[PDB]
């Protein structure tokens, strides 16, 4: 079979944006196998070795001012530039979540499920309300799930002791809509 | 923090695998097909609003390989430690009988970036309709990957996402069947 050892090398240039494009931080990192060896943090302004394996590079690269200049100005020519290139279909991408409420196939007490799927961006807020007032306890989330296709999904449960007439509401706030989406369960 | 765009690339010996891609908040914007030497967008639409000179990625890949050889040498040829993937199978949306849906096989937190994935419908391999993504980066420097299988839910059918990776002592079969 195949038992030969593998040797991996990764290079990652991460552009971190804060408040639109107000503050930008470029983080250039080299990873040998599963270990970062050298990096360039725009906040630092020069290459710094992360492990001894990376010392030669940090030292050699910093000795080249031309290289340093390009890297320092990359927060503009690279980061800010690429941000603008795809802002319309990324930063501004919005797909409304599909929301439904049904009791779980498990569970006295009744476990309610608020399924929220196919939405984008990932930042989202879903809360449960019993008769118009936030439910703090009992709530349990599956967490935010990234589907890999510019889509997210999540399930937020609410254990309850239902009484005829109660109205359990699942509320979902998302950038795709101005006012919050609400789906009600009538006990 | 608000947004993160990542240009992630790697070269792997001795599989001589190479990859070059852009990431936006965890979602792939595009990767370069090393063979056809062209940009392949994650969603057809992106290609109508932006472009990338794919050929340029290859120049970076050449340098990456040489750098790998250099690092391989100064580490005294220290091979990478295999790390087995976590595998999860979920649906694209709440499942309902005979209502078109999609099985997502999440292959997460693993390295090196080489994996064999196969979908199984009642013990047999499925090809029609399936798609997959390239290897995606992780903060811990391991990888994530998605495989997809469009399907027609039924009570009978039992699926499996069969995953092979050097970190696994044996093929991992993640079972999925209608339970609603």
């Amino acid at each position: 079979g195949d038992t030969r050892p593998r040797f991996l090398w990764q290079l990652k240039f991460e552009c971190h944006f804060f408040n639109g494009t107000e503050r930008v931080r470029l983080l250039e990192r080299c990873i040998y196998n599963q270990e970062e060896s050298v990096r360039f943090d725009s906040d630092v302004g020069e290459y710094r070795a992360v492990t001894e394996l990376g010392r030669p590079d940090a030292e050699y690269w910093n000795s080249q001012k031309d290289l340093l200049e390009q890297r320092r100005a990359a927060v503009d020519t690279y980061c800010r530039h690429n941000y603008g290139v795809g802002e319309s279909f990324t930063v501004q991408r919005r797909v409304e979540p599909k929301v439904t409420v049904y009791p779980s196939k498990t569970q006295h007490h009744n476990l309610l499920v608020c399924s929220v799927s196919g939405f984008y961006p990932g930042s989202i807020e879903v809360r449960w309300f019993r008769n118009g007032q936030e439910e703090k306890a009992g709530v349990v989330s599956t967490g935010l799930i990234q589907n890999g296709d510019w889509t997210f999904q999540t399930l937020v449960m609410l254990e309850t002791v239902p009484r005829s007439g109660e109205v359990y509401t699942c509320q979902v706030e998302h950038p795709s809509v101005t006012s919050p989406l609400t789906v009600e369960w009538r006990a | 923090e608000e947004h993160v765009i990542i240009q992630a690339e790697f070269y792997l010996n001795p599989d001589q695998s190479g990859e070059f891609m852009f990431d936006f908040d965890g979602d792939e914007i595009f990767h370069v097909d090393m063979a056809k030497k062209e940009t392949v967008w994650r969603l057809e639409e992106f290609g109508r609003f932006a472009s990338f000179e794919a050929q340029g990625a290859l120049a970076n890949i050449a340098v990456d390989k040489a750098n790998l050889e250099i690092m391989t040498k100064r580490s005294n040829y220290t091979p990478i430690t295999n790390v087995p993937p976590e595998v999860t199978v979920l649906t694209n949306s709440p499942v309902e009988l005979r209502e078109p849906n999609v099985l997502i096989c999440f292959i997460d937190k693993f390295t090196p970036p080489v994996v064999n994935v196969t979908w199984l419908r009642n013990g047999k391999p499925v090809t029609t309709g399936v798609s997959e993504t390239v290897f995606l980066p992780r903060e811990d420097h391991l990888f994530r990957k998605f495989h997809y299988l469009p399907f027609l839910p039924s009570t009978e059918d039992v699926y499996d996402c069969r995953v092979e990776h050097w970190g696994l002592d044996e093929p991992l079969l993640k079972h999925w069947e209608f339970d609603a």
């Binding site: 050699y60 795809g86 | 240009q7 120049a59 970076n60």
Partner: peptide, 13 residues
């Protein structure tokens, strides 16, 4: 609009 890439630097020899 065109996406631009950061070039990979050669390691110290």
């Amino acid at each position: 609009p065109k996406y631009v890439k950061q070039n990979t630097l050669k390691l110290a020899t």
